[PDB]
């Protein structure tokens, strides 16, 4: 009920932000590695 609803809403608001940070590291590492590779 209330605990189930709070667990669901927390999961659905936490998945997209976490995926956002993970894509952020993907972007950042890709760019820095591209910059460093060409020296």
């Amino acid at each position: 009920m209330l605990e189930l609803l709070k667990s669901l809403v927390f999961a659905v608001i936490m998945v997209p932000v976490v995926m956002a940070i993970i894509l952020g590291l993907i972007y950042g590492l890709g760019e820095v590695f591209n910059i460093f590779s060409g020296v």
């Binding site: 667990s7 999961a11 998945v15 993970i22 890709g30 590779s37 060409g38």
Partner: protein, 1034 residues
């Protein structure tokens, strides 16, 4: 195998049904306990010598016992504690894994051969052997709230009408009583004894003669005369059954009818066996019971039965009595089960949501939801079959392995879905091709996980069992998951998939799905071109790898190490040690002060104080005291300022002002069975036969020397009692003989007047109880009182005790200790809040090296376990390394390719160390397990990537760079999905507030760091290792 079961879905369904039935049967019948048998088996022998000082008990009792207890196999170490009260305790701790039910018989049988070699008094009291490594399931305190009943009345009521019923329920093992039942006390009176010309030996003889049972026989005897018809039993004199009957015992009757009665010379009452321990619950007199769980029994059911049985008895409870539960362990098990259920439900919902987000197909989402519970039930069945139980560690392993099950399901489903999308074939052939391509990788990773987790179970000692639970659970889960992925899942991919057309990956629809697919494809293209660019070069990132390696090594060296984190159990101990010579009154005053402080200045935190006077963990006596403070539920203690640590720090800071007492407060270890204090135990042993004064001086010098480094050693305190003044009575033997007084009479009078003698047994209200004889307080309480006693000479006159005896003072130790047969003393204390235990151990060894020659050092308790890390030497990690190397070389034919796979291992260890350093947690068992899990996950990702690249390179003619780029493009969605699932599922472990949250926090932090860093730094690095290995070893 997978294609074989693809054509036969119901064969896999039948296997799944069998596994589910086995899991249900296993969960129906399985023992439940807080912890497994972690502590080593231990047997304690207890003997009592009433009214005897430490030296008499040490030489005359425990010397003979120690001498005759040699030859017992699997013995680890023995310790012995004597006391001035008259109690001696010998604790023998054996090796781990041995059957205690045979060692107990061995020690008992060896003891029974030394019984006739002991004095008569200890034999009459009797010695008892028991198992101390059992742990208490609960303690039930019973209190009086009006003032009628005293400690003795309550203890007898418990022993009579509560002990039997509580012991006779289901699942209850040993039941211990913290009090003593009644005993007829006979208090003499020297004035009255002198008045009637009597001595205590006369009273003893009269009691022995008039309180005996005689076998009268039988009317109409066994050989009958010819013609007998009557037969019955003769009931002659029997044991006396009342105080009024004991008061009518004759002592001296003349022929003219004049008589002396026992009541005329002494006071008869009903008291306790020993008035040494006074227990007060919240200021009221109280008694207690200790219930231990029997082996192979359900904890929750036993607790519920105990509560129901106790609640049954209130109508028959006499006067004003109340039942309380100061300490029970069921809430921890209930919390563990609740956490397991919550983690399972959260993982299922989360994986369904992420599959709907990515694969956009409900039929794909529903596949794992009917596969993970099958593996869970299979793990339950296998764990039940092996012989394990439902502890607080096995369920932790299960919540850890949920991620592995989700990973396997994600890998299989995503591979089949992408094959269908990029091939256009329908579920059947696509599933066949995907299973044929991935079966070898699945078998290889299963073997790798088994090889990396099995050797952890070969540890010895407590660490051995702690690692064994997790290792067995993890390997069983991995095996069941890979078997399920081989058998059940391919059928699901065969049947429950919709054959959509190629190109309809959501790009034909708008909203969140099409847009999200758009950035996903854009980011995938960016990542692929970036990794191609970085793979164009080789030597630029080798320096980055070396930098990561050296940073990880520095973090590993810097991180402090410990054994097991402390936890908020809601109960903590407070110890009071008065100065030498202090009596019970001052101890009671200090205990009352402590109770008042706890119940006044901490009303919102504490719940009850169970003060005990006369007994302490250091040593029993009228000088020490203990108090077990229990707190309210964790729901009512929010924040980190209302936990055990803050409470005990504030308590000791406040108690520092208590004069005439060094009151300390501390928290018991997380595993109560192993040790009683949270710090190391260190023991100094005499070897050159120096004695006691030299040992005491050496100990004091060592304590002062260790106190000079207040940076890594804290609360370094002795575990014994300091020497005390003693009273010495010297009897002039020739003066006593000249006056006509026998030495036997003097010795008996002195031993039965001041020490108290146990005479006979009697039947009270239908039970057996002892009868004790001792003087009446006021006549045995000061040295001058020794002159009030009179002894009868041969002539019939009474001579005072002061006419042939002298007196003087001396110094004596009230507590003598022995270790392994040699005199020894113990120092117990913890380390600094910001340093490792091992460094403190090494510095303590160096300090002990400076001791005067003739004194050695040793470890005991958890310290010994901490010294059992010789198996934790690289001799085992290297074994695991070669085993996994052999497994990897066997999976794919190469002696050099597994190097690339192993190069990914540090990339998760670095993140685990980063998380540990950020949170500040120490290197312990739970962190080690989490680190191993992260290593396994990173190895799994590396295995998948390398296997796909090798298959692309070999089966087709794809070049090195092209095949590597295609493989890393292909194995991107599964890796991200699995990483997201694991990271989001381990959120509660990191965010856990309390209720045994230390291990959860440690494991969650390690898992988070390892998973995040491995996911970030493996995709960019594994191809580099692969291409470098292939080109260098071309």
């Amino acid at each position: 195998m997978p294609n074989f079961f693809i054509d036969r879905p119901i064969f896999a369904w039948v296997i799944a049904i069998i596994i589910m039935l086995a899991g249900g049967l296993a969960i129906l019948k399985l023992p439940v306990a807080q912890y497994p048998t972690i502590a080593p088996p231990a047997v304690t022998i207890s003997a009592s010598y009433p009214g005897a000082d430490a030296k008499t008990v040490q030489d005359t009792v425990t010397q003979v016992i120690e001498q005759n207890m040699n030859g017992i196999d699997n013995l680890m170490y023995m310790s012995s504690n004597s006391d001035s009260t008259g109690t001696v305790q010998i604790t023998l701790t054996f090796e781990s894994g041995t059957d205690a039910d045979i060692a107990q018989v061995q020690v008992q049988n060896k003891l029974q051969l030394a019984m006739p070699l002991l004095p008569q008094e200890v034999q009459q009291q009797g010695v008892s052997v028991e198992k101390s490594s059992s742990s208490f399931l609960m303690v039930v305190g019973v209190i009086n709230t009006d003032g009628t009943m005293t400690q003795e009345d309550i203890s007898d009521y418990v022993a009579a009408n509560m002990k039997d019923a509580i012991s006779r329920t289901s699942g209850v093992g040993d039941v211990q009583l913290f009090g003593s039942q009644y005993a007829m006390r006979i208090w003499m009176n020297p004035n009255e004894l002198n008045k009637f010309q009597l001595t205590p030996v006369d009273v003893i003889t009269a009691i022995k003669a008039q309180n005996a049972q005689v076998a009268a026989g039988q009317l109409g005897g066994t050989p009958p005369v010819k013609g007998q018809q009557l037969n019955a039993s003769i009931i002659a004199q029997t044991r006396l059954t009342s105080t009024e009957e004991f008061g009518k015992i004759l002592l001296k009757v003349n022929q003219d009818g004049s008589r002396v009665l026992l009541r005329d010379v002494a006071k008869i009452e009903l008291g306790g066996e020993n008035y040494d321990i006074i227990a007060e619950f919240n200021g009221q007199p109280a008694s207690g019971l200790g219930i231990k769980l029997a082996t192979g029994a359900n904890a929750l059911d036993t607790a519920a039965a105990i509560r129901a049985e106790l609640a049954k008895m209130e109508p028959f409870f006499p006067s004003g009595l109340k039942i309380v539960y100061p300490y029970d362990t069921t809430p921890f098990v209930k919390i563990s089960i609740h956490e397991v259920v919550k983690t399972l439900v959260e993982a299922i919902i989360l994986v369904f949501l992420v599959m709907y987000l990515f694969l956009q197909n409900f039929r794909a989402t529903l596949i794992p939801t009917i596969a993970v519970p099958v593996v869970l039930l299979g793990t339950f069945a296998v764990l039940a079959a092996f012989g394990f139980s439902i502890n607080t560690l096995t369920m932790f392993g299960m919540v850890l392995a949920i991620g592995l099950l989700v990973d396997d399901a994600i890998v299989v489903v995503e591979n089949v879905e992408r094959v269908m999308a990029e091939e256009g074939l329908p579920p059947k052939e696509a599933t066949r091709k995907s299973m044929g391509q991935i079966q070898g990788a699945l078998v290889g990773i299963a073997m790798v996980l088994s090889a990396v987790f099995v050797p952890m179970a070969f540890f010895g000692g407590s660490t051995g069992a702690i690692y064994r639970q997790f290792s067995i659970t993890i390997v069983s889960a991995m095996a069941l998951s890979v078997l399920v992925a081989l058998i059940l899942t391919p059928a699901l991919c065969a049947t429950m998939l919709k054959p959509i057309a190629k190109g309809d990956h959501g790009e034909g629809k708008k909203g969140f799905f099409g847009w999200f697919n758009r950035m996903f494809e854009k980011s995938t293209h960016h990542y692929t071109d970036s990794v191609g660019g970085i793979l164009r070069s080789t030597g630029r990132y080798l320096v980055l790898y070396l930098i990561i390696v050296v940073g990880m090594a520095y973090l590993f060296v810097r991180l402090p190490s410990s054994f097991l984190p402390d936890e908020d159990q809601g109960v903590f101990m407070t110890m009071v040690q008065l100065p030498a010579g202090a009596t019970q009154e001052r101890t009671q005053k200090v205990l009352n002060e402590v109770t008042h402080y706890y119940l006044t200045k901490e009303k919102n935190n504490v719940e009850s104080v169970f003060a005990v006077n006369g007994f302490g963990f250091a040593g029993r006596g009228q000088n020490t005291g203990i108090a077990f403070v229990s707190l309210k539920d964790w729901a009512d203690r929010p924040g980190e300022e209302n936990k055990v640590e803050a409470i005990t720090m504030r308590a000791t800071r406040a108690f520092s002002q208590i004069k005439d007492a060094m009151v300390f407060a501390f928290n018991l270890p997380a595993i109560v069975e192993l040790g009683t204090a949270t710090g190391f135990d260190f023991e100094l042993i005499d070897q050159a036969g120096l004695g006691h004064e030299k040992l005491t001086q050496a100990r004091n010098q060592l304590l002062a020397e260790a106190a000079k480094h207040p940076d890594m050693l804290t609360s370094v305190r002795p575990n014994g009692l300091e020497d005390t003044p003693q009273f010495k009575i010297d009897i002039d033997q020739e003066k006593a003989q000249a006056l006509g007084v026998s030495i036997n009479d003097i010795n008996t009078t002195l031993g039965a007047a001041w020490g108290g003698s146990y005479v006979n047994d009697f039947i009270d209200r239908g039970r057996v109880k002892k009868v004790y004889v001792m003087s009446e307080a006021k006549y045995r309480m000061l040295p001058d009182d020794i002159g009030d006693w009179y002894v009868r000479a041969a002539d019939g006159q009474m001579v005072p005790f002061s006419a042939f005896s002298s007196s003087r003072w001396e110094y004596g130790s009230p507590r003598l200790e022995r270790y392994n047969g040699l005199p020894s003393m113990e120092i117990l204390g913890q380390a600094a809040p910001g340093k490792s235990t091992g460094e403190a151990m090494e510095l303590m060894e160096q300090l002990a090296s400076k001791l005067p020659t003739g004194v050695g050092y040793d470890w005991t308790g958890m310290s010994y376990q901490e010294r059992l890390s010789g198996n934790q030497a690289p001799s085992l990690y290297a074994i695991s390394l070669i085993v996994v190397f052999l497994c990897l070389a066997a999976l794919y034919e190469s002696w050099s390719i597994p190097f690339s796979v192993m190069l990914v291992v540090p990339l998760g260890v670095i993140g685990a160390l980063l998380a540990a350093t950020f949170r500040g947690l120490t290197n312990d068992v739970y962190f080690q397990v989490g680190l191993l899990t992260t290593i396994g996950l990173s190895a799994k990702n590396a295995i998948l990537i390398v296997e796909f690249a090798k298959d692309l390179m070999d089966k087709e003619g794809k070049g090195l760079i092209e095949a590597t780029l295609d493989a890393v493009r292909m194995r991107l969605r599964p890796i991200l999905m699995t990483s997201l699932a694991f990271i989001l599922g381990v959120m509660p472990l990191v965010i856990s507030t309390g209720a045994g949250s230390g291990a959860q926090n440690a494991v969650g932090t390690g898992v988070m760091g390892g998973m995040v860093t491995a996911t970030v730094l493996a995709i960019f690095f594994v191809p580099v290792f692969f291409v470098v290995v292939r080109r260098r070893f071309s």
